[PDB]
Amino acid sequence: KEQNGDVKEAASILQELQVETYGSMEKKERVEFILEQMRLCLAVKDYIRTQIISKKINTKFFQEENTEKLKLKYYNLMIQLDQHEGSYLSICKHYRAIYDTPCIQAESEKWQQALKSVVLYVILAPFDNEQSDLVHRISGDKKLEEIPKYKDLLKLFTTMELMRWSTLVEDYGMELRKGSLESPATDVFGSTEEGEKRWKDLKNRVVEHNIRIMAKYYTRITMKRMAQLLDLSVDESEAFLSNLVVNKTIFAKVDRLAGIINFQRPKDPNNLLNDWSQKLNSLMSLVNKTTHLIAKEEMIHNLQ
Amino acid sequence: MQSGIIHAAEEKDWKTAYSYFYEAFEGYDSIDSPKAITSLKYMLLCKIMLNTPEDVQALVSGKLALRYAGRQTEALKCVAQASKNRSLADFEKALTDYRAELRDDPIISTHLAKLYDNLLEQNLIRVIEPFSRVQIEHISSLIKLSKADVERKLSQMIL
Amino acid sequence: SYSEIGGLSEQIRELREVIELPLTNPELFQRVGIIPPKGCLLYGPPGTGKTLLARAVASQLDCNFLKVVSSSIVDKYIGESARLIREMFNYARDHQPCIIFMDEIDAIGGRRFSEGTSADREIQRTLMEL
Ligand SMILES: Nc1ncnc2c1ncn2[C@@H]1O[C@H](COP(=O)(O)OP(=O)(O)OP(=O)(O)O)[C@@H](O)[C@H]1O
Questions:
Q1: Which of A40, A93, A240, B159 could anchor a disulfide with A10, C-beta 3.0 to 4.6 Å?
Q2: Can you name the residues that pair with A175 across neighbouring β-strands?
Q3: Which residues carry this modification: N6-acetyllysine (chain C)?
Q4: DSSP state of A74
């Protein structure tokens, strides 16, 4: 605090942190001291060290049952480091832990913006099977639907279909002036570079989401139809399909010269195709046979 | 070290060639820094010769490579990163600033022509994988190359 | 009697540390990085008081303690008193922490210097077990 510290002074305390971890056990005060240096490490600008010392904090968890409530307020410092560079998914599960601080509140504005902060990262996170059941835990809550933008958010997820992206900007472009709560848009659009990266992120998510229904419904499509469907040039569609094909999330062959493009159908020349298809379909009426049998058997014994 | 150089000109064995440079660095360690900093260039480059860029980052991430980190280890990491990303434009952009470290390569023609012959199909596997039927003229615009040698290289890929 | 024996002070406190301290305080050792010593040796009669001192350590620290005279490992046929050292160590792993006495370790510690007879060989065999 004397010289306000710098890259070197913050490094002097670094090597001294772990000296007393194994020396003695201190419940509260030590924890408060061990989080003091990373908030200076943000000013050091060196992140690779900040994540190491932050990796020493997780082995101290779970810190609950002591403090309660202060250390729950420190997660607000950790999300700052995780949200910064490479991971949008690392804040996903941790913002549900920063959602436990307004649980004790006794506060409305902080809590009301906690809900939007926890609900809006679904788009920023790349789609995964863990995300699917993640959003279902928060859905159905009694406090969550209080936000009208939440109904738009949910509408894009449930059963997909299609929507105009500019009309999406009609709902999400008002939230900058709207509020009440401007904090989520303060994180997104606060930095011009951050906001632009999440604009291209939202675009990547909606165009990736339009694709996965096309993957189930094709069969085939004309190339020029996908351009007017996604409201972008065919060159942009080429870029998009290049990243989707290298992600090998869905196999496709999209011919540009002849205009015929399609996702799947999988080849399956002979064996497995006819096997599973023909046989299981035939077993349908076979296993259902005995099922309706007893249905008529009970109906005829009810009246006779 | 010399065993490594001769094996690099022989090109017969690309495995033990990395072993010799590794042991040589173990000798140069803790005594002479100038030999230790120049020893990593050959081992990592020979691992790029083996077309395994993923292990390069793992070697430079250890505590032993952090003390010896410098302007050369970033030139090794950028070749590993361009081979992993499979982009010749990034490779050439970084090739100008690191040319000072590229001149120390005893043979600049071998490694660069073999890597170019490699990155050719590493750029082709991105354009070919999405669709089977492809025109030559529009796909040659991505790699920015005449269609003649391209068709020659593709037919070679069939062979 | 641990007070009655008089000396030797630095030996008394020394075995108190290396014997008793790993039991109660493994933390002090595991912090510095040092592995706790598992064994010790006493020898008289340059002086004497061996079985006294160590005896009052067994009846002092209490906890779990095991008494061994070197003459009970004789066993006659089939030196399975070796497997009694194995099984004995297993029950020392049962009642652990435990302490082991060893009185008159010269005979059960011999050198097998000159190859000879049978007894020395099977004794050396139980020593291989130890
Ligand atoms: N420092 C001492 N304080 C009290 N008594 C002692 C001391 N040293 C020896 N003695 C006495 O010696 C007797 C035998 O105990 P001790 O353990 O010394 O036998 P020992 O060392 O096996 O004998 P030796 O080594 O001669 O075979 C005990 O009755 C004890 O009173």
A1: A40
A2: none
A3: 76
A4: T
Please tell me the residue having the least CA distance from ligand 1 atom 9: C49
Considering only CA atoms, which residue is closest to atom 7 of ligand 1?
A: C49
Sign of CA dihedral A64, A68, A71, A76: positive
How far apart are the C-alpha atoms of C120 and C11, rounded to whole Å?
A: 34
H or E element: which one contains B73?
helix B71-85
Q: What is the largest CA-CA distance in chain C?
A: 51
Judge whether C31 is closer than 8 Å to chain A, CB to CB. Answer: yes
CB of A19 less than 8 A from some CB of C: no
Which of B16, B107, A243, B13 minimizes the C-alpha distance to B115? B107
Cβ proximity of A117 and A95 under 8 Å: yes
Tell me whether residue B44 is exposed, middle or buried, using C-beta atoms within 10 angstroms of its C-beta: 0 to 12, 13 to 18, 19 or more: buried
Among the partner residues B130, B132, B134, nearest to A242 by beta-carbon distance: B130
Helix, strand, coil shares of chain C, percent, nearest 5, are: 50, 5, 45
Q: Annotation-wise, does C46 bind a ligand? A: yes
Ligand 1 pocket check for C116: Cβ under 6 Å: no
How far apart, in Å, are the Cα atoms of A136 and each of A129, A130, A132, A152, B111? 12, 10, 7, 16, 53
B contact test, residue of A237, A246, A263 with most B CBs within 10 A: A246
Spatial CA neighbour of B61 closest among B78, B50, B73, B49: B73
Q: Is C32 on the interface with A (CB under 8 A)?
A: no
DSSP C103: B
Cβ neighbours for B20, distance < 8 A, ≥ 6 positions apart: B1, B3, B4, B7
Query: By the 8 A CB rule, do B104 and B69 touch?
Result: no
Nearest residue by C-alpha to atom 13 in ligand 1: C49
Which of A81, A147, A141 shows the shortest CA–CA distance to A117?
A147
Angstroms from A221 CA to nearest CA on chain B: 14
From the CB of C6, is ligand 1 less than 6 Å away?
yes
The whole-angstrom separation of Cα A180 and Cα A186 is: 12
A22 touches chain C (CB under 8 A): yes
At residue A110, φ and ψ (nearest 5 deg) are: -60, -45
The CA R_g of chain B, rounded to the nearest whole Å, is: 18
Please give the residue of chain B at the shortest CA–CA distance from A245: B130
Question: Which residue type, as a one-letter code, is found at position A182?
Answer: E
Q: What experimental approach yielded this model? A: cryo-EM
Residue A274 CB-density burial (10 A; 0-12 exposed, 13-18 middle, 19+ buried): exposed
Pick from C59, C63, C46: nearest CA to C4: C59
Handedness of CA A285, A291, A292, A294 (dihedral sign): positive
Q: Which residues of B touch A258 (CB under 8 A)?
A: 133
Helix residue ranges, H only, chain A: 7-17, 29-34, 38-44, 47-58, 75-84, 90-98, 101-104, 109-119, 121-124, 129-138, 149-157, 165-172, 183-188, 192-217, 223-230, 234-246, 271-303
* Three-state DSSP class for residue C68: coil
Contact between residue C61 and residue C52 where contact means Cβ atoms under 8 Å apart = no
Residue C48 marked ligand-binding: yes
